[model samples]
Target: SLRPKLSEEQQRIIAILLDAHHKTYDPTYSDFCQFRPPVRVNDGGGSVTLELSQLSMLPHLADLVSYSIQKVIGFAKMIPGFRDLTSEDQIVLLKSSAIEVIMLRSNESFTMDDMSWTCGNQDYKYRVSDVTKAGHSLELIEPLIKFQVGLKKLNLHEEEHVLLMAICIVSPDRPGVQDAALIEAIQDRLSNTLQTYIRCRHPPPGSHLLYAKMIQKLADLRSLNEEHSKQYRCLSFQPECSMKLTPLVLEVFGN
Candidate 1:
C-alpha cells in the first residue's frame, strides 16, 4: 500500500499519544457520549428568561474543571519524555498548561449550535450564561467559545488532537521551567511528528496551512490561559466562594 512514510520514532510517538488519549477521559470516546438537552431560548411562558440561579452551579463547574486538571496531569505523564523533566519543571509545566489543555479538550464536549459544553452527561450541559453565573465574565467565556468553534472547524483527526495536547504541555517557554533545553528538544520532536503526521493524513493543498494554524491556536491559548488565571485569582479572593473550590483547584490556581 502506498502511503506517506513516518520514521520509526514518529510512529512510536504517535502510538504513545494514541494510548494516552484513550486512557484519559475523552467525552467523545464511545464509552462517554455527550448528552445534549433540549434547547429552550426562554421560559416556557416566553416572557421570563430561563436561567440558573446565581453561583448555584459554580461548585459543580469548579469540580468538573478541577477534575480536568487532574486528567491533564495524567495525560501529560503518559507523553514520552515528559516524565524525564525535573519534578519542579514538571509541576510548573502542568500548572501553566493545564487550563489551556482543558480548553483544548473541551472541543469534545462543546456544541457550536448552542455555544455550550455538554459535559459528559445529561445533567451537565452548560451554556455561557451558566458559566457567567459561576462568576466568570464574558471576557473569558466569549473567547473560549470562539476558540472552541475555530478549533472544531479545523476537523482535526484524533492523532492531531492528542499530539496538540501533548505539545501544549511540553512547552519550554512557560515561566519557571528549569530545563528549557530539554523541554525544547521534546517539543521540537513532537512538532516534527505532528507536521509529518499532517503531511501523511491531510491533503497536500492544506497540510502546510494546517500545521501553521495549529501553532496559531497554541498562541491563542496563552492569552486564554492568562485570562483564566486572572479570573481564578479574583474568584479566590472571595472567602465564601473560595470554599466551594476543591483543594486541587486551589493548589493548581492558588499561585
Candidate 2:
C-alpha cells in the first residue's frame, strides 16, 4: 500500500531496529517453550518482566514494538488527507496515557528465581516459585502510546476488558502458553487508538494508511500465536476465556 515518506531521522531509527530484530528473533519450538507453572509444569515456575522505563534503550525485545509503530505512521501517509503531515512531526501525547494508569497485575507474580527452568510435558511438578524470569522494555512510539490511552478512555481498548480469553491457548497460570487471546485483544484496542490518533493528527482533508494497516496488525499478531491442545494425563482439564494489541501493516514498522 502507498505510505508516507519518512524523514531521514525516522527512517534511520526504524531501519536500525528492524534489521536488529531480523538478526535475533527466534520462535522455535521447545518442551519448555510455553510452560510456566501449574498449567504445563508444576512448582517453581516463572516468566518475564516487562517494564516501560527501558523502552528507549531496547528495540530487540519484541518484534511487535517497531513493527506496530512504523505501520501506523506509514499507513497514515497512504490515506489522502493524513499524508500531508510531515514525517518528522512530533506530538505530545495527552498526559493521561502516561500517568499512573491502572494496569492488571497477575493473580500471582512469577514463581521463580532470578532464573529457573520448568518442563512442558508435565514431567516435572512444583509451585509457582522455583523458576526464572526474563526482563522486557516497552520501546513504544510516544504518540502511539498516547493514542492508545485515548482509545482506552474511549472504551475501544479490549485487552483491559477481560483478564483472559481463549483459555486453552495458555494453560491458565502457565508461563509462555501463547497468551494469544490477551495479545489479540490488545491488538484490537490498539487499532481504535491509532485510528483516533491519526484522525486527529491528520486533517480530514488529508490521506493516511491507504489500506487498513491497523486492522491487519491485529490479524497477524493472532496468526503468529501458537498453543498446545490439552492431551496430558498429568493434569485435569478446564476452560476459561477473555483478550488483542494491534499495529503496522504486519510490521514493527515494515520496510
Candidate 3:
C-alpha cells in the first residue's frame, strides 16, 4: 500500500524547495535556477516529496541555506509583512524549509569502451566530451516555502503546487554535448570510481572519502568578503550552481 500522503503543510514545503531556486556564487555572479518537484493530484487534495540527491544539478545548496536562514530571520524581524505570521507558523517554516547539497570535483575525464547498454539511450550515460564536467559541480536545495508566511494565509497556495523540472547547466567553457560513446564511457568510469568516494565507502583503486570530510570542514564556512592581496590566482571559494538559460531566466522568473 502507498504510505499516507503528506499534509498540506508538508506538500507546501515541497513546492517551496523545488520552486525557489537558491544562489550559487561566482565571486559576485549567480547562476541559480529554480526547480519544481514531481507533483500529482490525489483523491481529495495532493502531495510532494524531494531529496538532496535530486539537486545534483544545482551547486549552491549550502551557501543558499546559510543566506536563506539569515534572510528569513531578518525578514521575520524587519518586514511588517512578516510580522503578521504567528511565531508558530514562523517556527514551522524554519524547521520545514532547509535543503542539503552534496558536491564533488574531478580533474580529468576517463574513457569507456566495450560496455553494453541494454536499457537504451535515455538511460545511457552522457559522454564526457558531450558533457564537460564543471571544474566544480554541485547539488542545490531551494526551499519552496513562501518568503512571506502571510502569503500562505492569503490563500495563494495554488502557485505552491508547481513541480519543477531539473535544468542541468553546463558551462560554456567546456565541450558542448558530445556523443553516446563518450557519454557511456564516462558514466561507467564514474560509477566504477569516484561516486564511491562521494558516499564514504571503501573506495575503488585510487579513491578516498574526501567528500564526507569536506562536508565536516565546511562547518566553519562564513561569508567573509576579504580578498587576496597578491598573485594572479584567485583565493576565492565562490562556486557557481546557478541555472543556465538561453535568452535568460527573466522570461520566466527574471534574473
The TM-score leader among the candidates is 1
TM-score, per-candidate, Cα-based:
0.87, 0.20, 0.18
Q: lDDT for every model?
A: 0.80, 0.25, 0.24
- Over 1-255, each residue of candidate 3 has an lDDT whose tens digit, in order, gives 123334454444344433342222122222223322112122121111121212231223233334444443442233222233446443433332221111110000111232221112332222221111211111111111111121222221222211110100111111233343433343333232222223333233322344333323223111110111110012112223234211221121121
What's the ranking of the predictions by TM-score, best on top? 1, 2, 3
Residue-by-residue lDDT tens digits, candidate 1, 1-255 = 244577998999999988987788765534322212223333333221122323555676777777788789999999999989999999999999989998998898888777778754455677876675566776898898999999998888888999999999999999989999999999999998998888877875656589899999999999999998898787666647676678888888887
Instruction: Give the winner by lDDT: 1 or 2.
Output: 1
Q: Model 3: residues >4 Å from true position, as ranges?
A: 1-60, 97-255
Q: Model 1, which residues run further than 4 Å from truth?
A: 1-4, 28-54, 120-122, 204-208
- Tell me the lDDT of model 1 at 205: 64
Return the candidate ranking by lDDT, descending. 1, 2, 3
Error of 1 at 245 (Å): 0.4
lDDT of 2 by residue, 119-138 (tens): 22333322213111112212
Candidate 2, position 239, lDDT? 18
